[PDB]
A paper describes a structure:
The coronavirus surface is studded with spikes that initiate infection by binding to specific cellular receptor(s) leading to membrane fusion and viral entry. Each trimeric spike has a globular crown and a thin stalk anchored to the viral envelope. Each S protomer consists of a N-terminal S1 subunit and a C-terminal S2 subunit. For HCoV-NL63, the S1 subunit is made up of 5 smaller subdomains: 0, A, B, C and D, with domain B acting as the receptor binding domain (RBD) for ACE2.
In the current study we used cryoET and subtomogram averaging to determine the structures of the full-length S ectodomain on virions. Subtomogram averaging analysis of these spikes with imposed C3 symmetry produced an average at 6.9 Å resolution for the crown and lower resolution ~11Å for the upper part of the stalk. To further assess any conformational variability within the S crown, we applied focused classification on both the RBD region and domain 0 region of the three S protomers within each trimeric spike. This analysis confirmed that all three S protomers in a spike are in the pre-fusion, “closed” conformation with all RBDs lying down and no “upward” conformation of domain 0 was detected. Of the 36 on the crown, 29 are predominantly high-mannose glycans (>80%), consistent with reported N-linked glycan profile on HCoV-NL63 S ectodomain produced in Drosophila S2 cells. Spike crowns could be tilted up to 80° relative to the stalk, with a median tilt of 41.6 ± 15°. The averages reveal the significant conformational variability of the trimeric spike through tilting and rotation that are mediated primarily by a large hinge localized to an upper region of the stalk ~100 Å away from the viral envelope. From our simulation results, we determined that most of the bending was localized to the disordered region (residues 1226–1245) separating the two coiled-coil motifs of the stalk. In our stalk model, N-linked glycans at N1242 and N1247 sit between the upper short coiled-coil and lower long coiled-coil and likely contribute to the blob-like density at the bending hinges in spike subtomogram averages. Simulations with the N1242 glycan removed alone bent at comparable angles (Δgly1242 peaks at 20°–25°), which are smaller relative to those with the N1247 glycan removed alone (Δgly1247 peaks at 40°–45°). Removal of N1242 glycan alone or both N1242 and N1247 glycans reduced HCoV-NL63 S mediated infection by ~70% at three different MOIs, in contrast to the negligible effect of removing N1247 glycan alone.
Residue numbers in the entry:
A (entry chain A): 970 to 1260
B (entry chain C): 1164 to 1260
């Protein structure tokens, strides 16, 4: 039954995102908080392009600044002065421009270093959320992960996580174990199960979802000495909380004199009856023969 | 699974929390590597409590068609079958005479 609602709630979520990418922003800001992530995702992509543009726009703009020379165009320097005097002017521009190139190279090399550190996270997420369904909290999606979808973007990747969110809750009357005869006690082995009882029937479910079923003997260990806040129940009525459990040796004592109850043997049939009556039969035969 | 001075118990490998073993913790690993514990099936309950052979017990003392109702082990109200046929032979001799 879950898959009937999940498809309906997922198809609308896809449409909302594809509409939000369509630049229609303020009309759907009232809908939900899905805008809170798409706005940051768009701002990051805008910034990664603006920063790339500005670096070259700054480099190409330092040719205008003439250094302590006549002008910033060399053809003008060689047009006014002779050959022996222009060499003391050209080098003043040459030294400035070489130092300008060096600072740009030293920045590009630093820029490349961050990208390799960012690629490790991209590979790790591909390895852990796309192929394995990782279970670490606070990792892909803030809830319970199901799957993920990848798509490309300007020199980057764009993920699409898919999580679950609870809507309704249920109230459950929990317990902590079963103590039989005050000394022997049973508790659940796995620490992710809750033993509970509503209006006279006991069931076992999980702690994350609500999937009730019937308890079985294969889920209890022996926890002797019976903490006080347990369930008081005698061993003769243990089958009312744990089905598929019957005492093997006590029934031997009971079912022994009690077979005639369930089910009653046939009367006058060998070898249930007609013993000790054959001495009487012999006596009657002798009496009849004598008579 | 460990045993001190004749009693077997099961604990964890990180902390020391002893308790009693139960049948719900064992699988069947047939062909018995040599460095195991040698024990016969008639005495398996001394290492695993809450375990009994279901069919061997009925093979031992569940013998008659019902267990009883029928003259069974040392039943006092009942009497002896197959203890009148010798007298039947004697009385047959008397009848022939
Ligand atoms: C399931 O199910 C099943 C079925 O059911 C099961 O199976 C089974 O079951 C059953 C049931 O039925 C069970 O049974 C049970 O049981 C329980 C428990 O038990 C306990 O107890 C017992 C007894 O008590 C015991 O046995 C056990 O164990 C043991 O222990 C012990 C201790 O105690 C040990 O040791 C031992 O000891 C002894 C004594 O002591 C001995 O030793 C010794 O020692 C000493 C020192 O110490 C030494 O020195 C000496 O000393 C002196 C003084 O003391 C002098 O000085 C001298 O000089 C010197 O020398 C010496 O030497 C020594 N000896 C020698 C010989 O050496 C011995 O030996 C030892 O051994 C042991 O080891 C142990 N064992 C083991 C194995 O381990 C326990 O503990 C019970 O409880 C029960 O019962 C109850 O209940 C019932 C009901 O239910 C009731 O009824 C009862 O009551 C009864 O009543 C009756 C009436 O009716 C009566 O009867 C009467 O009797 C009388 C008689 O008296 C007396 O005796 C005789 C013998 C003689 O003597 C005479 O003379 C006198 O008098 C008359 O006859 C009248 O007539 C009548 O009536 C009775 O009695 C009563 N009882 C009583 C007891 O009392 C009760 O209450 C039941 O029985 C079974 O078990 C089972 N099985 C098994 C296997 O287990 C199953 O199990 C089930 N399962 C589940 C899981 O559940
Ligand atoms: C729990 O518990 C419970 C209760 O307990 C249970 O239940 C039950 O139990 C019981 C117990 O008791 C059990 O029982 C047991 O068992 C065991 C096992 O078994 C095994 O073995 C058997 C037999 O051997 C079998 O049956 C089985 O199975 C089977 O197998 C088979 C194979 O082998 C198969 O097949 C088959 O085969 C057959 C044969 O072969 C047939 O076939 C055929 O084939 C052929 C070819 O091959 C063909 O061809 C032909 O060939 C020829 C040649 O060979 C010619 O040539 C011609 O011509 C041609 O044709 C043919 O055809 C064919 N046939 C036809 C008909 O077709 C058949 O058929 C087939 O079928 C099968 O299939 C199978 N089955 C199935 C079902 O699957 C197995 O393997 C056992 O072991 C046991 O026993 C043992 O032990 C005891 C003690 O305990 C002992 O005692 C015994 O010994 C004995 O002794 C006695 C004395 O006392 C004796 O008696 C005697 O007898 C004699 C007789 O002889 C003969 O026979 C007759 C019949 C006739 O013939 C005559 O003549 C002759 O001589 C006299 O009578 C004297 O007087 C007396 O005394 C006996 O015998 C002995 N035995 C023997 C064997 O030997 C032993 O040791 C037991 O029994 C049951 O089982 C159960 N149930 C069930 C269900 O199971 C339960 O189980 C439990 N549970 C748990 C979980 O544990
Ligand atoms: C499974 O069953 C087992 C066994 O049946 C059970 O184990 C014991 O359960 C009891 C109760 O849950 C545990 O606590 C005991 O309580 C005793 C108190 O009962 C007397 O006192 C009542 C009033 O006392 C209260 O109010 C006063 C103020 O007025 C306050 O100071 C007290 O602290 C307390 O809060 C009184 O009403 C009661 O009377 C009953 O009976 C009359 C009929 O006679 C009826 O009309 C009443 O309505 C009422 O039902 C009674 O007089 C207490 O005495 C006892 O103390 C014992 O132990 C201490 C040591 O701890 C000793 O020093 C002391 O001398 C006593 O021996 C105890 O505190 C008890 O701890 C459990 N365990 C044991 C071993 O006894 C489980 O709880 C059950 N499990 C379940 C139900 O899940
Ligand atoms: C549960 O029980 C089962 C069955 O009972 C058991 O299974 C077998 O257990 C045995 C022993 O643990 C395993 O090993 C066998 O050992 C045999 C050796 O016994 C003879 O040799 C003794 C001296 O030999 C030693 O010293 C010499 C140097 O002197 C050295 O070269 C040898 O290698 C060895 O180290 C000797 O003392 C002994 O005599 C006994 O009996 C006398 C009374 O007669 C007594 O006075 C002594 O004190 C002593 O108790 C005996 O003569 C060995 O022969 C045997 O070899 C067989 O298998 C090989 C193939 O592997 C064949 O080639 C060979 O011909 C034999 O058939 C074997 O090595 C054995 O492996 C187990 N399994 C089987 C299938 O037999 C389990 O171990 C038990 N589990 C437990 C206890 O946890
Ligand atoms: C083949 O084997 C069978 C065994 O599988 C066997 O069945 C049983 O045999 C036992 C002994 O052989 C019988 O025990 C006897 O019980 C006498 C007491 O009987 C009184 O109650 C009778 C009614 O019984 C019904 O009610 C009781 C509960 O009260 C219940 O337990 C029974 O199962 C019955 O449902 C009375 O019978 C009257 O009523 C019936 C109708 O129900 C009529 O048909 C009768 O004719 C009669 O009117 C009876 O009168 C008694 O009141 C024991 O007698 C003791 O007690 C009395 C006082 O009541 C004393 O006066 C005696 O001196 C004595 O102390 C008697 O000793 C013995 O223990 C058992 O009842 C049989 N069960 C059944 C279901 O029949 C077969 O008998 C056997 N057959 C053969 C041919 O061998
Ligand atoms: C209902 O079924 C019953 C069984 O299913 C059946 O009981 C049997 O009846 C038979 C007769 O029909 C009995 O056989 C007789 O046995 C006499 C022997 O008696 C001597 O021993 C008695 C003690 O017996 C105990 O010890 C022997 C071992 O020695 C053991 O085998 C027994 O099982 C007993 O445990 C003496 O009784 C005295 O002691 C008891 C206590 O033990 C007291 O309660 C008594 O009151 C008494 O004080 C007895 O005194 C004898 O010493 C045979 O008699 C021999 O001895 C006399 C001399 O006294 C000779 O003159 C004889 O010639 C003969 O040699 C007798 O001939 C016969 O064989 C059988 O023992 C009974 N079994 C049981 C278990 O009781 C019922 O008959 C039946 N009901 C119906 C109506 O049929």
């Amino acid at each position: 039954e879950n898959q009937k609602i999940l498809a309906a709630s997922f198809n609308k979520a896809i449409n909302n995102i594809v509409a939000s990418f369509s630049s229609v922003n303020d009309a759907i800001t009232q809908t939900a908080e899905a805008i809170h992530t798409v706005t940051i995702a768009l701002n990051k992509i805008q910034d990664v392009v603006n920063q790339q543009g500005s670096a070259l726009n700054h480099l190409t703009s330092q040719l205008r600044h003439n250094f302590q020379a006549i002008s910033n165009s060399i053809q003008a320097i060689y047009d006014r002065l002779d050959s022996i005097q222009a060499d003391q002017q050209v080098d003043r521009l040459i030294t400035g421009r070489l130092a300008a190139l060096n600072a740009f190279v030293s920045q590009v090399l630093n820029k490349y270093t961050e990208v390799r550190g960012s690629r490790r996270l991209a590979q790790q997420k591909i390895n852990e959320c796309v192929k394995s369904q990782s279970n670490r909290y606070g990792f892909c999606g803030n809830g319970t992960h199901i799957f993920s979808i990848v798509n490309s973007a300007p020199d980057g990747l764009l993920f699409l996580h898919t999580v679950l969110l609870p809507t309704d809750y249920k109230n459950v009357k929990a317990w902590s174990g079963i103590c039989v005869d005050g000394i022997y006690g049973y508790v659940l082995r796995q620490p992710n199960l809750v033993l509970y009882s509503d209006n006279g029937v006991f069931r076992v479910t999980s702690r994350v979802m609500f999937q009730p079923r019937l308890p079985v003997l294969s889920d209890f260990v022996q926890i002797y000495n019976c903490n006080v806040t347990f369930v008081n129940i005698s061993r003769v009525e243990l089958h009312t909380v744990i089905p598929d459990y019957v005492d093997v040796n006590k029934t031997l004592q009971e079912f022994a004199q009690n077979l005639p109850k369930y089910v009653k043997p046939n009367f006058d049939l060998t070898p249930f009856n007609l013993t000790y009556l054959n001495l009487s039969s012999e006596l009657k035969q002798l009496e009849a023969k004598t008579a």
